[PDB]
Ligand binder design. Sequence first.
Ligand code: YW4
Length: 128
Amino acid sequence: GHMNPPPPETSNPNKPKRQTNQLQYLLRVVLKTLWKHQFAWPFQQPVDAVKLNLPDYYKIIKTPMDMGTIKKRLENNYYWNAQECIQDFNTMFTNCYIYNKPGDDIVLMAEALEKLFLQKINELPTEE
Ligand SMILES: Cc1noc(C)c1-c1cc(C(N)=O)c2c3ccc(C(C)(C)O)cc3n(Cc3ccccc3)c2c1
């Protein structure tokens, strides 16, 4: 534990909003494809350090990120540029690699998800 921090902010009415084909793709294709993956479930919500009894998790990870937060930030037009969203997915994978040991089952899961993420990002449509 001892306590989990509050989840990352997903909405801000002060931030200007815009819909772009790249942001639409990140939600409709990238997030959706990663969400349905067999290894997605531990990445769908913040790390529950209390349930897992990991008091050092939020001592090590100061920038937590999960797909449920990315989903809500996309639905709330929290990102202005697609690069901000791509960065949150990169933070999510990086936190897993920093916290856990290489070869751990959770790391192998994050790696398969990252492989699928990078394939979809290679297919990111040109800005319209
Ligand atoms: C991702 C990620 N990166 O580092 C950490 C640590 C996580 C992370 C995040 C979460 C979470 N979102 O709470 C869970 C989680 C939730 C519930 C359960 C139970 C067995 C109780 O069902 C087990 C869980 N494990 C452990 C785990 C280990 C190996 C394979 C799959 C899961 C997690 C690992």
